[PDB]
Design a protein around this ligand. Structure first.
Ligand SMILES: *[C@@H]1O[C@H](CO[C@@H]2O[C@@H](C)[C@@H](O)[C@@H](O)[C@@H]2O)[C@@H](O[C@@H]2O[C@@H](C)[C@@H](O)[C@@H](O)[C@@H]2O)[C@H](O[C@@H]2O[C@@H](C)[C@@H](O)[C@@H](O)[C@@H]2O)[C@H]1NC(C)=O
Ligand SMILES: CCCCCC/C=C/CCCCCCCC(=O)O
Ligand SMILES: CCCCCC/C=C/CCCCCCCC(=O)O
Lengths: 119, 121
């Protein structure tokens, strides 16, 4: 079933409801939220206007009551966030996370049946 | 008085390095100011708005310029972005958007050419 998002940084990004487990197999929003919290300095610095939405689209993925297919962000969302933010991360010794590699995400409109989220 | 370097930890590295006491809250010291603005620190880590830190610091540790010799407020638009981002969460958690940082107390950028204000990013 769908639950109201309780991860504070992921409220106000365009949708209200999520469902667990997410694609990292976090079992609760609490677990997901403790991890995504670590990205707050990157979000504050605004290296990319897509980052916040992108992070939330994976940590608290959108839930629709009638839809049971997973709705990842589109690859393009990831690409923009990565292009904006990875240089700054690299500058702090952080590589772009392995679990966030964009090639794992569907391309917008490539497959009619495979929907995804574009900001 | 007096153009002093900013010591409040939250407000270091926000884009200007100097402030002046007292502020609009009648804090006589940065230590007094810091104790209050640091109560908002969890909201900064929550990142309901990227503009929140700058907006708060522009109030509590206002910019001091050796060339202006008067207070320089954030533009209304800075407040409006912080508030649009963070008011919903503050209201949900039971904390009203405080009246001291009402956006209608701030100048709209360029509405009167002689009334300056700081915008950012
Ligand atoms: C997204 O959620 C908004 C907040 O809902 C409230 O908080 C959540 C966490 C739950 O506890 C809900 O049970 C609460 O209603 C919701 O907006 C609210 O709507 C009214 C009742 C009032 O509380 C407002 O202050 C809230 O913002 C959103 O609902 C949409 O937008 C609002 C502005 C109205 O127009 C609604 O009709 C809309 O559906 C909701 N968004 C969606 C798409 O459901
Ligand atoms: C911890 C407070 C840092 C504040 C300074 C602002 C600089 C931010 C850029 C560095 C981002 C920190 C890494 C976040 C990503 C991660 O932890 O995996
Ligand atoms: C970082 C330690 C505290 C973590 C506890 C989480 C609390 C979150 C409350 C959200 C922000 C509250 C804003 C208070 C504003 C005010 O003091 O008027």
């Amino acid at each position: 079933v769908c639950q109201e998002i309780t991860v504070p940084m992921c409220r106000g990004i365009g949708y209200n409801l999520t469902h667990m487990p997410n694609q990292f197999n976090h079992d609760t929003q609490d677990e997901a939220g403790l991890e995504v919290h670590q990205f707050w300095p990157l979000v504050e610095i605004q290296c990319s206007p897509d980052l916040r939405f992108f992070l939330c689209s994976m940590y608290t993925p959108i839930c629709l009551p009638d839809y049971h297919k997973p709705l990842p962000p589109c690859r393009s969302v990831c690409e923009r966030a990565k292009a904006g933010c990875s240089p700054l991360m690299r500058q702090y010794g952080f590589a772009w996370p392995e679990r966030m590699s964009c090639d794992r995400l569907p391309v917008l409109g490539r497959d009619a049946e495979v929907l995804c989220m574009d900001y």
